[PDB]
Curated annotation (Swiss-Prot):
<feature type="binding site">
    <location>
        <position position="114"/>
    </location>
    <ligand>
        <name>Ca(2+) 2</name>
    </ligand>
</feature>
<protein>
    <recommendedName>
        <fullName>Arabinoxylan arabinofuranohydrolase</fullName>
    </recommendedName>
</protein>
<feature type="binding site">
    <location>
        <position position="109"/>
    </location>
    <ligand>
        <name>Ca(2+) 3</name>
    </ligand>
</feature>
<feature type="binding site">
    <location>
        <position position="29"/>
    </location>
    <ligand>
        <name>Ca(2+) 3</name>
    </ligand>
</feature>
<feature type="binding site">
    <location>
        <position position="105"/>
    </location>
    <ligand>
        <name>Ca(2+) 3</name>
    </ligand>
</feature>
<comment type="similarity">
    <text>Belongs to the glycosyl hydrolase 43 family.</text>
</comment>
<feature type="binding site">
    <location>
        <position position="5"/>
    </location>
    <ligand>
        <name>Ca(2+) 2</name>
    </ligand>
</feature>
<feature type="binding site">
    <location>
        <position position="7"/>
    </location>
    <ligand>
        <name>Ca(2+) 2</name>
    </ligand>
</feature>
<feature type="domain" description="CBM6 2">
    <location>
        <begin position="2"/>
        <end position="119"/>
    </location>
</feature>
<feature type="binding site">
    <location>
        <position position="110"/>
    </location>
    <ligand>
        <name>Ca(2+) 3</name>
    </ligand>
</feature>
<comment type="function">
    <text>Cleaves arabinose units from O-2- or O-3-monosubstituted xylose residues, thereby assisting in arabinoxylan (AX) and short-chain arabinoxylo-oligosaccharide (AXOS) degradation. Preferres wheat flour xylan over oat spelt xylan as substrate. Does not display endoxylanase activity.</text>
</comment>
<feature type="binding site">
    <location>
        <position position="24"/>
    </location>
    <ligand>
        <name>Ca(2+) 2</name>
    </ligand>
</feature>
Amino acid sequence: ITKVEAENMKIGGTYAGKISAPFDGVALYANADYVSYSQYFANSTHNISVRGASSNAGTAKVDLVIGGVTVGSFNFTGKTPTVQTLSNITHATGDQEIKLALTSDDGTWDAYVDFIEFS
Ligand SMILES: [Ca+2]
Ligand SMILES: [Ca+2]
């Protein structure tokens, strides 16, 4: 397993910033808010998990982008943190940017991101 905390990544966008509740992590508020870091991959295919939460009862959606290509998304509904998992995602090998980004914000929720895990 490879686990990287959101709070240790590059944080970007107009509003993105760290939070301490409901976990140590990062809040994404508006479209183009993101966290990213560079990951070396020896292998092409991983199960990918992100722990996160919504700011409210709504469903926060976070895109997963690897090497600039969107490979899936994670949905977090409600304020209680959950772990969301994409199974068997194939992506580029070598050094690749990993980004968790908002693209579907509409002023009804914010997304809280705790960590990403590759297995
Ligand atoms: Ca928002
Ligand atoms: Ca964290």
